[PDB]
Amino acid sequence: LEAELQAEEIALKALVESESAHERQRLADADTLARSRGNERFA
Amino acid sequence: LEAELQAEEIALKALVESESAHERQRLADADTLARSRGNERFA
Amino acid sequence: EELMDGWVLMLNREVNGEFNRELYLLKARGMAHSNQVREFLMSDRGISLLPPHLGEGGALTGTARKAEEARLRRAEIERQTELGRLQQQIEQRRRRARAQIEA
Amino acid sequence: AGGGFFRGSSILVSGVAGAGKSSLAAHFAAAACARGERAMYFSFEEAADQAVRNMRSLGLDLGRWRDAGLLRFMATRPTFYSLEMHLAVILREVMRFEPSVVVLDPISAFTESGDRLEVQSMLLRIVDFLKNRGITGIFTHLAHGLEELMDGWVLMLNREVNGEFNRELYLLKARGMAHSNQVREFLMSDRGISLLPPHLGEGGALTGTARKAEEARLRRAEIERQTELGRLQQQIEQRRRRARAQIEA
Ligand SMILES: Nc1ncnc2c1ncn2[C@@H]1O[C@H](COP(=O)(O)OP(=O)(O)OP(=O)(O)O)[C@@H](O)[C@H]1O
Ligand SMILES: [Mg+2]
């Protein structure tokens, strides 16, 4: 049972890591898109 | 068994909360859309 | 056309095997006005404009409008039934936990 | 880049009727007057009092500048003069006042006043006279010759999508500078012409009500995914609590 619960802990970890990575990549992609459509380049 | 039923109660709670939030957000979205298509702005 | 202060364009187009009437204000100088292509009907009571169209798709007139209203109602009923069954299932689990506790 | 068009340039504003061509020209002239300079605005299809009233709803005050002797508003039908005398009057008047900005609204009103090559000759002479003096010329043209001689070109659109008409504008041409390549949507109001924030989405190219609908749809999808992740987290944690209870026993 202990080994099972340790495996579950590792699963929790991996899921949180994946969510954080997804948040990060969406912000990067949004910044890229807002760059390719912005008027910053002319200020 | 008690711990299981408490978990079930929490699940019921979360589901009802989600439904209420969904109702609310649909009303807000419907109001927004009916604004962007209405003749109120000219009364 | 250039010398006109207002301009009302009236349409009668074919969509879905029927002809639907519409009208919009192309030009109205000096004022604020709606930018909606509104659908209207003729009758013994004159020209009556129907309520504006509200839907995520939009731009449906005549019979297609009623069809989409019906479809939206059906989808809402479907979702409500889904939520109902889920609620009932979790509550049956709870009643179970009860019966076992009592025993 | 740099804050606008070059000074002595030739700018053509094009679009369909109701697009906003006259409003943009009036904004140009009103700004020119507001900086203390002088402007001349030649209208061939609207009267002076009517134009003032029409521009008043957009928040401009063309009357203030007329009463201050900084804006001369001249209105004459295309049939009042011959193509030669139209040019003569325009040049004489431009000479006397010594403007900084001259607007002709619209350039397309003279099409039936003569042959194509005659009206082109008149307009070319007007453009050359304006450019040899460093005067900025704003020409409004109705969409549907001398386009080639324009340094800037602003195309204004008013199109039908989703049972509504949405306004847009883009810079077709701006020689000598870097400029945006976006077809931006704008609105008119008591505050003038306001351009809405650019559109960011994987699909893109949505205007007006469809934009709000897609924003709502994106929010709904995000909420759905968040709820999915929540239920998964809760399920794995309930398994963990289980393993606990059994270990304790
Ligand atoms: N207070 C206002 N609020 C919102 N919109 C306005 C307001 N006043 C005017 N508008 C809009 O500004 C537009 C002005 O159009 P404008 O005359 O500038 O274009 P145009 O190309 O010069 O047309 P024309 O063929 O008459 O020369 C009106 O059609 C009207 O729809
Ligand atoms: Mg005009």
Author numbering:
A (entry chain J), B (entry chain H): 516 to 558
C (entry chain G): 413 to 515
D (entry chain I): 258 to 401, 411 to 515
Provide excerpts from the study.
Here we investigate the primordial circadian clock in Rhodobacter sphaeroides, which contains only KaiBC, to elucidate its inner workings despite missing KaiA. Using a combination of X-ray crystallography and cryogenic electron microscopy, we find a new dodecameric fold for KaiC, in which two hexamers are held together by a coiled-coil bundle of 12 helices. This interaction is formed by the carboxy-terminal extension of KaiC and serves as an ancient regulatory moiety that is later superseded by KaiA. Our kinetic data identify the difference in the ATP-to-ADP ratio between day and night as the environmental cue that drives the clock.
A coiled-coil register shift between daytime and night-time conformations is connected to phosphorylation sites through a long-range allosteric network that spans over 140 Å. Following phosphorylation, the coiled-coil pairs swap partners by interacting with the other neighbouring chain from the opposite hexamer, which resulted in a register shift that propagated around 115 Å along the entire coiled-coil. In the phosphomimetic state, the register comprised bulkier hydrophobic residues that resulted in a more stable interaction than for the dephosphorylated form. Furthermore, the C-terminal residues of KaiCRS-S413E/S414E interacted with the CII domain of the opposite hexamer, whereas the lack of electron density for the last 30 residues in the wild-type structure indicates more flexibility in the dephosphorylated state. We discovered that these conformational changes in the coiled-coil domain seemed to be coupled through a long-range allosteric network to the phosphorylation sites. The rotameric states of residues Ser413, Ser414, Trp419, Val421, Tyr436, Leu438, Val449 and Arg450 moved concertedly and pointed towards the nucleotide-binding site when the protein was phosphorylated or pointed away in the absence of a phosphate group.
